[PDB]
Amino acid sequence: NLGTELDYDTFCFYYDWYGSEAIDGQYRHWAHAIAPDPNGGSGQNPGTIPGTQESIASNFYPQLGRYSSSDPNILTKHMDMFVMARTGVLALTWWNEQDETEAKRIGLILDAADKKKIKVCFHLEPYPSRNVQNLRENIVKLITRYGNHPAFYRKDGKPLFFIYDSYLIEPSEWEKLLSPGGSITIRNTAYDALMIGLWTSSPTVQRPFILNAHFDGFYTYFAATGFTYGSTPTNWVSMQKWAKENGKIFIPSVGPGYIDTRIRPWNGSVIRTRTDGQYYDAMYRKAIEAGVSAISITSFNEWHEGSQIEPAVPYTSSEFTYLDYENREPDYYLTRTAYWVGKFRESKQ
Ligand SMILES: OC[C@H]1O[C@H](O[C@H]2[C@@H](O)[C@H](O)[C@@H](CO)O[C@@H]2O)[C@@H](O)[C@@H](O)[C@@H]1O
Ligand SMILES: OC[C@H]1CN[C@@H](O)[C@@H](O[C@H]2O[C@H](CO)[C@@H](O)[C@H](O)[C@@H]2O)[C@@H]1O
């Protein structure tokens, strides 16, 4: 009873898409295309961030440098960071790449996590032609491949998946997978799971979406307060009340800030300043005050979006002056996460 143990109702969104020339053949994701402005003109040639030491696809700069997500030595360090943050579940981005390098990295992440008693669940991304049939097939494959790994997460006996942009699939399709009577149900099968859909907009839209889709619960993802109704923390008390009334698990997402203008220069209105941790504190406090059972953290390491809690260092290169943790040390967001996990646990019975 030391106040240092991992919390297994705390999910931290993790991205495994970073590469180095030496391990991966290219400094993958550190190099990244710049997105055209969706409200902008034709003939934009926005260019690319080259992923050199000097110019990476983030407004911040990793303490660990331009690392590979396939480097077992980096993974070790990441797991130690999870232990410092007390975040017991790594919620792994999953893009259905169907390639050996994906398969290798997932096994490495599971192995490294297990050494530290961290668990892994999957965050099912909007891969091409995603639909409920190939989602079922992929859930079966992930549970078959990884379900007996000691680090594979279960909650009261069930795997858990987060489904990003779940609204891209109609509730009538979801029902087929997620109702106990659905044509291709997972309920009561070896492949049953807690399925957590993304609550985006107003209750008039989201309440029937979640019920009609038969999701087990919902999360909000966005680290930027006010980006959606669901990512506006003053709505969380009423979202939790509805969840409780309807037998759903609400897993609000909290984050330390947001800034993605290296890769999305037109998206400055979504910037949320970190204010030496005060933003993170405010958001985490709202989640805990809402009385939820589980919390998700956006993010461990979405460096493109500036939501990371992973350590960052000051850096000024000839090409860019990076943001940094300012008056706080590089590991502040890890140790502040541990503080909040303790407050969250204090709140759970
Ligand atoms: O436009 C940048 C934005 O893209 C993605 O968010 C989009 C979509 O995935 C979300 O569901 C809706 C919610 O209203 O917003 C966008 O259309 C995300 O990658 C997001 O992190 C990013 O900022
Ligand atoms: O994990 C959910 C969602 C969070 N925001 C992004 O990470 C998004 O991925 C898309 O944007 C990133 C850049 O931010 C890009 O590298 C990816 O290929 C996706 O286009 C995630 O889906």
Side-chain angles (χ1 to χ4, degrees), residues 1-20 22-44 46-76 78-98 100-103 105-114 116-240 242-243 245-285 287-328 330-342 344-349:
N1 195 12
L2 300 158
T4 60
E5 70 191 294
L6 294 166
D7 187 86
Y8 297 116
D9 299 305
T10 302
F11 297 86
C12 191
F13 291 117
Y14 185 94
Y15 296 84
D16 68 337
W17 55 31
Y18 300 107
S20 69
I23 290 174
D24 309 284
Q26 50 178 176
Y27 276 98
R28 190 161 98 93
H29 271 257
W30 308 115
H32 200 287
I34 299 166
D37 182 352
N39 303 125
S42 83
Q44 298 177 58
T48 80
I49 302 284
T52 56
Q53 189 164 347
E54 298 87 1
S55 188
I56 68 166
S58 181
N59 293 70
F60 294 88
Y61 207 92
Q63 185 176 57
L64 292 174
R66 290 177 297 157
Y67 62 78
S68 174
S69 300
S70 302
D71 184 340
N73 294 312
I74 293 293
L75 296 174
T76 294
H78 283 176
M79 303 310 158
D80 289 338
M81 293 171 179
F82 273 62
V83 170
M84 179 177 283
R86 304 182 65 194
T87 52
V89 195
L90 183 160
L92 179 54
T93 195
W94 191 85
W95 289 88
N96 194 22
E97 297 175 325
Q98 304 172 248
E100 68 188 301
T101 66
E102 173 183 74
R105 74 183 152 40
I106 296 167
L108 292 171
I109 290 166
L110 286 160
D111 287 349
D114 196 50
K116 304 299 158 41
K117 314 165 69 182
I118 302 155
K119 307 301 175 184
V120 176
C121 70
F122 295 87
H123 187 191
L124 306 180
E125 297 277 11
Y127 58 82
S129 292
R130 182 175 67 166
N131 64 58
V132 296
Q133 183 67 59
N134 60 48
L135 279 166
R136 196 182 194 284
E137 288 158 3
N138 289 325
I139 289 165
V140 170
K141 183 186 72 72
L142 292 170
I143 291 171
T144 299
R145 289 183 172 189
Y146 307 121
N148 287 324
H149 192 289
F152 189 90
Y153 182 71
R154 287 184 170 81
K155 176 62 176 180
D156 302 319
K158 285 185 188 164
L160 183 148
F161 296 87
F162 294 92
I163 311 298
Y164 188 68
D165 282 3
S166 48
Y167 62 83
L168 296 173
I169 292 171
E170 289 300 305
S172 62
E173 288 290 291
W174 287 115
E175 187 272 344
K176 293 152 56 158
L177 186 69
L178 301 184
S179 172
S183 295
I184 58 164
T185 191
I186 66 177
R187 305 310 181 183
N188 306 307
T189 78
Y191 309 108
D192 206 345
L194 297 171
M195 297 286 282
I196 309 300
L198 184 69
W199 177 305
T200 54
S201 67
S202 70
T204 51
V205 179
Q206 301 304 300
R207 294 172 169 181
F209 173 87
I210 290 295
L211 291 176
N212 293 331
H214 295 259
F215 278 104
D216 303 281
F218 55 94
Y219 75 127
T220 59
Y221 190 77
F222 309 103
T225 52
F227 183 63
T228 61
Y229 181 101
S231 70
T232 303
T234 53
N235 297 321
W236 290 350
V237 164
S238 59
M239 291 163 64
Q240 170 60 14
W242 183 84
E245 289 167 349
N246 292 93
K248 304 304 184 187
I249 304 164
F250 177 29
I251 314 186
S253 305
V254 302
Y258 187 94
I259 177 163
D260 68 1
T261 54
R262 289 225 77 202
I263 62 148
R264 306 192 186 102
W266 46 266
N267 203 36
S269 297
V270 189
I271 292 168
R272 300 289 180 273
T273 55
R274 297 208 178 198
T275 58
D276 277 333
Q278 294 169 95
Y279 179 94
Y280 193 40
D281 288 351
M283 200 169 189
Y284 223 128
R285 183 176 300 110
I288 293 165
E289 288 178 347
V292 298
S293 75
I295 293 174
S296 56
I297 299 170
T298 300
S299 61
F300 186 69
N301 65 343
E302 220 300 11
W303 287 95
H304 312 305
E305 292 185 331
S307 59
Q308 76 294 329
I309 66 168
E310 185 181 357
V313 291
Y315 182 48
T316 294
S317 75
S318 62
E319 302 308 300
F320 195 74
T321 300
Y322 295 85
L323 302 177
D324 61 48
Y325 296 165
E326 204 180 356
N327 301 301
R328 304 301 189 182
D331 65 5
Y332 173 83
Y333 291 92
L334 301 177
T335 58
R336 198 63 172 167
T337 299
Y339 170 84
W340 287 114
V341 165
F344 172 59
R345 289 173 70 84
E346 191 276 339
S347 84
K348 293 158 93 182
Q349 294 83 240

PDB file of all heavy atoms in Angstrom, residues 70-99, unseen atoms left out:
ATOM      1  N   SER A  70      10.437  -0.170 -32.851  1.00  0.00           N
ATOM      2  CA  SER A  70      10.907  -1.570 -32.908  1.00  0.00           C
ATOM      3  C   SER A  70      12.184  -1.819 -32.165  1.00  0.00           C
ATOM      4  O   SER A  70      12.688  -2.944 -32.190  1.00  0.00           O
ATOM      5  CB  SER A  70      11.081  -1.996 -34.383  1.00  0.00           C
ATOM      6  OG  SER A  70       9.872  -1.854 -35.083  1.00  0.00           O
ATOM      7  N   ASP A  71      12.721  -0.822 -31.480  1.00  0.00           N
ATOM      8  CA  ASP A  71      13.989  -0.948 -30.762  1.00  0.00           C
ATOM      9  C   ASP A  71      13.691  -1.487 -29.370  1.00  0.00           C
ATOM     10  O   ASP A  71      13.085  -0.789 -28.534  1.00  0.00           O
ATOM     11  CB  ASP A  71      14.674   0.411 -30.683  1.00  0.00           C
ATOM     12  CG  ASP A  71      16.026   0.376 -30.037  1.00  0.00           C
ATOM     13  OD1 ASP A  71      16.339  -0.592 -29.305  1.00  0.00           O
ATOM     14  OD2 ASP A  71      16.774   1.370 -30.235  1.00  0.00           O
ATOM     15  N   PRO A  72      14.068  -2.739 -29.073  1.00  0.00           N
ATOM     16  CA  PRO A  72      13.748  -3.290 -27.737  1.00  0.00           C
ATOM     17  C   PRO A  72      14.277  -2.425 -26.590  1.00  0.00           C
ATOM     18  O   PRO A  72      13.690  -2.384 -25.516  1.00  0.00           O
ATOM     19  CB  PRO A  72      14.412  -4.671 -27.749  1.00  0.00           C
ATOM     20  CG  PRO A  72      14.488  -5.057 -29.194  1.00  0.00           C
ATOM     21  CD  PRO A  72      14.688  -3.768 -29.944  1.00  0.00           C
ATOM     22  N   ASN A  73      15.384  -1.697 -26.806  1.00  0.00           N
ATOM     23  CA  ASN A  73      15.929  -0.893 -25.771  1.00  0.00           C
ATOM     24  C   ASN A  73      15.046   0.374 -25.484  1.00  0.00           C
ATOM     25  O   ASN A  73      14.899   0.833 -24.347  1.00  0.00           O
ATOM     26  CB  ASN A  73      17.399  -0.678 -26.138  1.00  0.00           C
ATOM     27  CG  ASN A  73      18.176  -2.021 -26.086  1.00  0.00           C
ATOM     28  OD1 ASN A  73      18.050  -2.752 -25.106  1.00  0.00           O
ATOM     29  ND2 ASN A  73      18.888  -2.383 -27.135  1.00  0.00           N
ATOM     30  N   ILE A  74      14.453   0.916 -26.533  1.00  0.00           N
ATOM     31  CA  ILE A  74      13.478   2.010 -26.368  1.00  0.00           C
ATOM     32  C   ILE A  74      12.260   1.486 -25.656  1.00  0.00           C
ATOM     33  O   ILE A  74      11.710   2.133 -24.772  1.00  0.00           O
ATOM     34  CB  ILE A  74      13.121   2.612 -27.735  1.00  0.00           C
ATOM     35  CG1 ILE A  74      14.316   3.324 -28.352  1.00  0.00           C
ATOM     36  CG2 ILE A  74      11.899   3.528 -27.646  1.00  0.00           C
ATOM     37  CD1 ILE A  74      14.784   4.572 -27.643  1.00  0.00           C
ATOM     38  N   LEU A  75      11.806   0.295 -26.035  1.00  0.00           N
ATOM     39  CA  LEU A  75      10.578  -0.246 -25.434  1.00  0.00           C
ATOM     40  C   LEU A  75      10.775  -0.445 -23.917  1.00  0.00           C
ATOM     41  O   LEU A  75       9.881  -0.161 -23.137  1.00  0.00           O
ATOM     42  CB  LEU A  75      10.111  -1.516 -26.151  1.00  0.00           C
ATOM     43  CG  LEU A  75       9.715  -1.292 -27.613  1.00  0.00           C
ATOM     44  CD1 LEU A  75       9.400  -2.615 -28.288  1.00  0.00           C
ATOM     45  CD2 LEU A  75       8.555  -0.265 -27.788  1.00  0.00           C
ATOM     46  N   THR A  76      11.955  -0.930 -23.541  1.00  0.00           N
ATOM     47  CA  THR A  76      12.279  -1.059 -22.139  1.00  0.00           C
ATOM     48  C   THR A  76      12.077   0.266 -21.392  1.00  0.00           C
ATOM     49  O   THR A  76      11.418   0.344 -20.350  1.00  0.00           O
ATOM     50  CB  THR A  76      13.728  -1.558 -21.966  1.00  0.00           C
ATOM     51  OG1 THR A  76      13.788  -2.902 -22.478  1.00  0.00           O
ATOM     52  CG2 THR A  76      14.140  -1.596 -20.509  1.00  0.00           C
ATOM     53  N   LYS A  77      12.634   1.318 -21.969  1.00  0.00           N
ATOM     54  CA  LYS A  77      12.558   2.658 -21.385  1.00  0.00           C
ATOM     55  C   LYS A  77      11.103   3.136 -21.340  1.00  0.00           C
ATOM     56  O   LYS A  77      10.682   3.702 -20.322  1.00  0.00           O
ATOM     57  CB  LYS A  77      13.422   3.652 -22.170  1.00  0.00           C
ATOM     58  CG  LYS A  77      14.945   3.379 -21.990  1.00  0.00           C
ATOM     59  CD  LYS A  77      15.909   4.207 -22.805  1.00  0.00           C
ATOM     60  CE  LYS A  77      17.351   3.951 -22.362  1.00  0.00           C
ATOM     61  N   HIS A  78      10.343   2.896 -22.396  1.00  0.00           N
ATOM     62  CA  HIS A  78       8.933   3.260 -22.367  1.00  0.00           C
ATOM     63  C   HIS A  78       8.195   2.556 -21.261  1.00  0.00           C
ATOM     64  O   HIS A  78       7.355   3.171 -20.571  1.00  0.00           O
ATOM     65  CB  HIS A  78       8.269   3.000 -23.725  1.00  0.00           C
ATOM     66  CG  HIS A  78       8.578   3.999 -24.753  1.00  0.00           C
ATOM     67  ND1 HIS A  78       8.138   3.868 -26.047  1.00  0.00           N
ATOM     68  CD2 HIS A  78       9.233   5.182 -24.681  1.00  0.00           C
ATOM     69  CE1 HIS A  78       8.503   4.951 -26.706  1.00  0.00           C
ATOM     70  NE2 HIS A  78       9.190   5.764 -25.912  1.00  0.00           N
ATOM     71  N   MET A  79       8.464   1.266 -21.042  1.00  0.00           N
ATOM     72  CA  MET A  79       7.769   0.559 -19.980  1.00  0.00           C
ATOM     73  C   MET A  79       8.118   1.110 -18.609  1.00  0.00           C
ATOM     74  O   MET A  79       7.260   1.230 -17.726  1.00  0.00           O
ATOM     75  CB  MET A  79       7.953  -0.937 -20.082  1.00  0.00           C
ATOM     76  CG  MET A  79       7.508  -1.533 -21.385  1.00  0.00           C
ATOM     77  SD  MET A  79       5.851  -1.049 -21.925  1.00  0.00           S
ATOM     78  CE  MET A  79       6.013  -1.387 -23.690  1.00  0.00           C
ATOM     79  N   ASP A  80       9.381   1.486 -18.422  1.00  0.00           N
ATOM     80  CA  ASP A  80       9.782   2.131 -17.181  1.00  0.00           C
ATOM     81  C   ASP A  80       9.048   3.455 -17.009  1.00  0.00           C
ATOM     82  O   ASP A  80       8.704   3.847 -15.892  1.00  0.00           O
ATOM     83  CB  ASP A  80      11.273   2.339 -17.098  1.00  0.00           C
ATOM     84  CG  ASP A  80      12.055   1.003 -16.900  1.00  0.00           C
ATOM     85  OD1 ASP A  80      11.448   0.035 -16.421  1.00  0.00           O
ATOM     86  OD2 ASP A  80      13.235   1.019 -17.217  1.00  0.00           O
ATOM     87  N   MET A  81       8.799   4.184 -18.110  1.00  0.00           N
ATOM     88  CA  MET A  81       8.020   5.425 -18.057  1.00  0.00           C
ATOM     89  C   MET A  81       6.561   5.159 -17.647  1.00  0.00           C
ATOM     90  O   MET A  81       5.970   5.910 -16.864  1.00  0.00           O
ATOM     91  CB  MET A  81       8.095   6.165 -19.386  1.00  0.00           C
ATOM     92  CG  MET A  81       9.493   6.669 -19.645  1.00  0.00           C
ATOM     93  SD  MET A  81       9.577   7.307 -21.340  1.00  0.00           S
ATOM     94  CE  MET A  81      11.282   7.884 -21.432  1.00  0.00           C
ATOM     95  N   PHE A  82       5.955   4.089 -18.199  1.00  0.00           N
ATOM     96  CA  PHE A  82       4.618   3.692 -17.756  1.00  0.00           C
ATOM     97  C   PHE A  82       4.584   3.397 -16.264  1.00  0.00           C
ATOM     98  O   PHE A  82       3.642   3.747 -15.568  1.00  0.00           O
ATOM     99  CB  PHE A  82       4.118   2.460 -18.556  1.00  0.00           C
ATOM    100  CG  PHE A  82       3.419   2.775 -19.865  1.00  0.00           C
ATOM    101  CD1 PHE A  82       4.059   3.420 -20.911  1.00  0.00           C
ATOM    102  CD2 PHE A  82       2.097   2.430 -20.027  1.00  0.00           C
ATOM    103  CE1 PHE A  82       3.360   3.720 -22.085  1.00  0.00           C
ATOM    104  CE2 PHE A  82       1.405   2.749 -21.181  1.00  0.00           C
ATOM    105  CZ  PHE A  82       2.062   3.401 -22.194  1.00  0.00           C
ATOM    106  N   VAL A  83       5.599   2.676 -15.776  1.00  0.00           N
ATOM    107  CA  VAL A  83       5.676   2.391 -14.344  1.00  0.00           C
ATOM    108  C   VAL A  83       5.752   3.691 -13.542  1.00  0.00           C
ATOM    109  O   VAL A  83       5.042   3.853 -12.524  1.00  0.00           O
ATOM    110  CB  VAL A  83       6.856   1.459 -14.020  1.00  0.00           C
ATOM    111  CG1 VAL A  83       7.097   1.366 -12.505  1.00  0.00           C
ATOM    112  CG2 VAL A  83       6.554   0.076 -14.600  1.00  0.00           C
ATOM    113  N   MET A  84       6.575   4.644 -13.981  1.00  0.00           N
ATOM    114  CA  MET A  84       6.625   5.942 -13.295  1.00  0.00           C
ATOM    115  C   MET A  84       5.283   6.681 -13.286  1.00  0.00           C
ATOM    116  O   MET A  84       4.939   7.318 -12.304  1.00  0.00           O
ATOM    117  CB  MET A  84       7.693   6.805 -13.915  1.00  0.00           C
ATOM    118  CG  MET A  84       7.859   8.186 -13.352  1.00  0.00           C
ATOM    119  SD  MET A  84       9.219   9.151 -14.076  1.00  0.00           S
ATOM    120  CE  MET A  84      10.587   8.401 -13.267  1.00  0.00           C
ATOM    121  N   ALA A  85       4.528   6.566 -14.380  1.00  0.00           N
ATOM    122  CA  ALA A  85       3.244   7.224 -14.508  1.00  0.00           C
ATOM    123  C   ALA A  85       2.117   6.473 -13.829  1.00  0.00           C
ATOM    124  O   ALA A  85       1.034   7.022 -13.667  1.00  0.00           O
ATOM    125  CB  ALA A  85       2.923   7.400 -15.976  1.00  0.00           C
ATOM    126  N   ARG A  86       2.364   5.200 -13.455  1.00  0.00           N
ATOM    127  CA  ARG A  86       1.371   4.322 -12.820  1.00  0.00           C
ATOM    128  C   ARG A  86       0.244   3.930 -13.779  1.00  0.00           C
ATOM    129  O   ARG A  86      -0.846   3.487 -13.330  1.00  0.00           O
ATOM    130  CB  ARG A  86       0.814   4.896 -11.520  1.00  0.00           C
ATOM    131  CG  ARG A  86       1.896   5.219 -10.515  1.00  0.00           C
ATOM    132  CD  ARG A  86       1.309   5.748  -9.207  1.00  0.00           C
ATOM    133  NE  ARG A  86       0.530   4.702  -8.565  1.00  0.00           N
ATOM    134  CZ  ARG A  86      -0.312   4.920  -7.571  1.00  0.00           C
ATOM    135  NH1 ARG A  86      -0.503   6.146  -7.099  1.00  0.00           N
ATOM    136  NH2 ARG A  86      -0.999   3.912  -7.071  1.00  0.00           N
ATOM    137  N   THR A  87       0.499   4.063 -15.096  1.00  0.00           N
ATOM    138  CA  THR A  87      -0.505   3.733 -16.090  1.00  0.00           C
ATOM    139  C   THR A  87      -0.387   2.230 -16.435  1.00  0.00           C
ATOM    140  O   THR A  87       0.561   1.828 -17.091  1.00  0.00           O
ATOM    141  CB  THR A  87      -0.307   4.607 -17.336  1.00  0.00           C
ATOM    142  OG1 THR A  87       1.040   4.513 -17.755  1.00  0.00           O
ATOM    143  CG2 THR A  87      -0.607   6.037 -17.041  1.00  0.00           C
ATOM    144  N   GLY A  88      -1.340   1.420 -15.997  1.00  0.00           N
ATOM    145  CA  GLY A  88      -1.218  -0.011 -16.150  1.00  0.00           C
ATOM    146  C   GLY A  88      -1.581  -0.559 -17.505  1.00  0.00           C
ATOM    147  O   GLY A  88      -1.250  -1.730 -17.744  1.00  0.00           O
ATOM    148  N   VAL A  89      -2.263   0.209 -18.376  1.00  0.00           N
ATOM    149  CA  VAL A  89      -2.666  -0.333 -19.662  1.00  0.00           C
ATOM    150  C   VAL A  89      -2.163   0.556 -20.793  1.00  0.00           C
ATOM    151  O   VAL A  89      -2.425   1.773 -20.816  1.00  0.00           O
ATOM    152  CB  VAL A  89      -4.191  -0.551 -19.783  1.00  0.00           C
ATOM    153  CG1 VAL A  89      -4.499  -1.452 -20.966  1.00  0.00           C
ATOM    154  CG2 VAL A  89      -4.798  -1.113 -18.481  1.00  0.00           C
ATOM    155  N   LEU A  90      -1.472  -0.057 -21.737  1.00  0.00           N
ATOM    156  CA  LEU A  90      -0.975   0.548 -22.950  1.00  0.00           C
ATOM    157  C   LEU A  90      -2.020   0.235 -24.026  1.00  0.00           C
ATOM    158  O   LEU A  90      -2.276  -0.935 -24.324  1.00  0.00           O
ATOM    159  CB  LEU A  90       0.410  -0.063 -23.239  1.00  0.00           C
ATOM    160  CG  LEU A  90       1.195   0.448 -24.449  1.00  0.00           C
ATOM    161  CD1 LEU A  90       2.654   0.129 -24.290  1.00  0.00           C
ATOM    162  CD2 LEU A  90       0.666  -0.105 -25.756  1.00  0.00           C
ATOM    163  N   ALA A  91      -2.622   1.293 -24.584  1.00  0.00           N
ATOM    164  CA  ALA A  91      -3.695   1.151 -25.571  1.00  0.00           C
ATOM    165  C   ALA A  91      -3.072   1.414 -26.955  1.00  0.00           C
ATOM    166  O   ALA A  91      -2.860   2.561 -27.359  1.00  0.00           O
ATOM    167  CB  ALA A  91      -4.842   2.079 -25.266  1.00  0.00           C
ATOM    168  N   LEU A  92      -2.714   0.306 -27.606  1.00  0.00           N
ATOM    169  CA  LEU A  92      -1.855   0.319 -28.778  1.00  0.00           C
ATOM    170  C   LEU A  92      -2.600   0.619 -30.074  1.00  0.00           C
ATOM    171  O   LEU A  92      -3.518  -0.127 -30.459  1.00  0.00           O
ATOM    172  CB  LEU A  92      -1.190  -1.060 -28.872  1.00  0.00           C
ATOM    173  CG  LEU A  92      -0.243  -1.306 -30.041  1.00  0.00           C
ATOM    174  CD1 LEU A  92       0.849  -0.271 -30.128  1.00  0.00           C
ATOM    175  CD2 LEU A  92       0.344  -2.709 -29.951  1.00  0.00           C
ATOM    176  N   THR A  93      -2.203   1.683 -30.764  1.00  0.00           N
ATOM    177  CA  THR A  93      -2.743   1.975 -32.095  1.00  0.00           C
ATOM    178  C   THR A  93      -2.606   0.755 -32.978  1.00  0.00           C
ATOM    179  O   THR A  93      -1.562   0.068 -32.956  1.00  0.00           O
ATOM    180  CB  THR A  93      -2.007   3.203 -32.673  1.00  0.00           C
ATOM    181  OG1 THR A  93      -2.709   3.740 -33.799  1.00  0.00           O
ATOM    182  CG2 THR A  93      -0.597   2.885 -33.142  1.00  0.00           C
ATOM    183  N   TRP A  94      -3.622   0.493 -33.797  1.00  0.00           N
ATOM    184  CA  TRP A  94      -3.621  -0.713 -34.614  1.00  0.00           C
ATOM    185  C   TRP A  94      -4.263  -0.427 -35.950  1.00  0.00           C
ATOM    186  O   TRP A  94      -5.443  -0.088 -36.024  1.00  0.00           O
ATOM    187  CB  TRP A  94      -4.262  -1.894 -33.900  1.00  0.00           C
ATOM    188  CG  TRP A  94      -4.034  -3.176 -34.593  1.00  0.00           C
ATOM    189  CD1 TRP A  94      -2.938  -3.999 -34.460  1.00  0.00           C
ATOM    190  CD2 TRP A  94      -4.888  -3.827 -35.548  1.00  0.00           C
ATOM    191  NE1 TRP A  94      -3.036  -5.082 -35.253  1.00  0.00           N
ATOM    192  CE2 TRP A  94      -4.227  -5.018 -35.945  1.00  0.00           C
ATOM    193  CE3 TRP A  94      -6.125  -3.542 -36.087  1.00  0.00           C
ATOM    194  CZ2 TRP A  94      -4.783  -5.908 -36.847  1.00  0.00           C
ATOM    195  CZ3 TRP A  94      -6.665  -4.421 -36.989  1.00  0.00           C
ATOM    196  CH2 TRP A  94      -5.990  -5.585 -37.364  1.00  0.00           C
ATOM    197  N   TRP A  95      -3.442  -0.565 -36.999  1.00  0.00           N
ATOM    198  CA  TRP A  95      -3.786  -0.101 -38.348  1.00  0.00           C
ATOM    199  C   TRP A  95      -3.956  -1.235 -39.366  1.00  0.00           C
ATOM    200  O   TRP A  95      -4.133  -0.966 -40.547  1.00  0.00           O
ATOM    201  CB  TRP A  95      -2.737   0.898 -38.845  1.00  0.00           C
ATOM    202  CG  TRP A  95      -2.806   2.206 -38.150  1.00  0.00           C
ATOM    203  CD1 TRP A  95      -2.180   2.562 -36.992  1.00  0.00           C
ATOM    204  CD2 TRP A  95      -3.683   3.303 -38.492  1.00  0.00           C
ATOM    205  NE1 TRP A  95      -2.548   3.835 -36.648  1.00  0.00           N
ATOM    206  CE2 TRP A  95      -3.484   4.308 -37.535  1.00  0.00           C
ATOM    207  CE3 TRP A  95      -4.601   3.533 -39.552  1.00  0.00           C
ATOM    208  CZ2 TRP A  95      -4.152   5.515 -37.575  1.00  0.00           C
ATOM    209  CZ3 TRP A  95      -5.274   4.725 -39.595  1.00  0.00           C
ATOM    210  CH2 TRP A  95      -5.047   5.697 -38.615  1.00  0.00           C
ATOM    211  N   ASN A  96      -3.907  -2.487 -38.904  1.00  0.00           N
ATOM    212  CA  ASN A  96      -4.106  -3.627 -39.797  1.00  0.00           C
ATOM    213  C   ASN A  96      -3.132  -3.568 -40.977  1.00  0.00           C
ATOM    214  O   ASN A  96      -3.528  -3.716 -42.134  1.00  0.00           O
ATOM    215  CB  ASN A  96      -5.540  -3.698 -40.288  1.00  0.00           C
ATOM    216  CG  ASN A  96      -5.868  -5.014 -40.914  1.00  0.00           C
ATOM    217  OD1 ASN A  96      -5.216  -6.033 -40.661  1.00  0.00           O
ATOM    218  ND2 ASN A  96      -6.818  -5.003 -41.792  1.00  0.00           N
ATOM    219  N   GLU A  97      -1.856  -3.384 -40.686  1.00  0.00           N
ATOM    220  CA  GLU A  97      -0.916  -3.247 -41.783  1.00  0.00           C
ATOM    221  C   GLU A  97      -0.587  -4.571 -42.448  1.00  0.00           C
ATOM    222  O   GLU A  97      -0.102  -4.573 -43.578  1.00  0.00           O
ATOM    223  CB  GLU A  97       0.352  -2.541 -41.368  1.00  0.00           C
ATOM    224  CG  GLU A  97       0.078  -1.126 -40.924  1.00  0.00           C
ATOM    225  CD  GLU A  97       1.331  -0.442 -40.397  1.00  0.00           C
ATOM    226  OE1 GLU A  97       2.190  -1.094 -39.763  1.00  0.00           O
ATOM    227  OE2 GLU A  97       1.464   0.770 -40.630  1.00  0.00           O
ATOM    228  N   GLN A  98      -0.810  -5.706 -41.787  1.00  0.00           N
ATOM    229  CA  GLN A  98      -0.619  -7.033 -42.386  1.00  0.00           C
ATOM    230  C   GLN A  98       0.796  -7.157 -42.927  1.00  0.00           C
ATOM    231  O   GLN A  98       1.019  -7.536 -44.080  1.00  0.00           O
ATOM    232  CB  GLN A  98      -1.658  -7.302 -43.467  1.00  0.00           C
ATOM    233  CG  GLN A  98      -3.075  -7.174 -42.984  1.00  0.00           C
ATOM    234  CD  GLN A  98      -4.021  -7.252 -44.130  1.00  0.00           C
ATOM    235  OE1 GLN A  98      -4.685  -6.284 -44.491  1.00  0.00           O
ATOM    236  NE2 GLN A  98      -4.012  -8.378 -44.764  1.00  0.00           N
ATOM    237  N   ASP A  99       1.765  -6.839 -42.089  1.00  0.00           N
ATOM    238  CA  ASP A  99       3.136  -6.933 -42.498  1.00  0.00           C
ATOM    239  C   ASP A  99       3.957  -7.408 -41.337  1.00  0.00           C
ATOM    240  O   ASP A  99       3.638  -7.258 -40.158  1.00  0.00           O
ATOM    241  CB  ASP A  99       3.684  -5.620 -42.960  1.00  0.00           C
ATOM    242  CG  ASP A  99       3.814  -4.670 -41.823  1.00  0.00           C
TER     243      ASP A  99
END
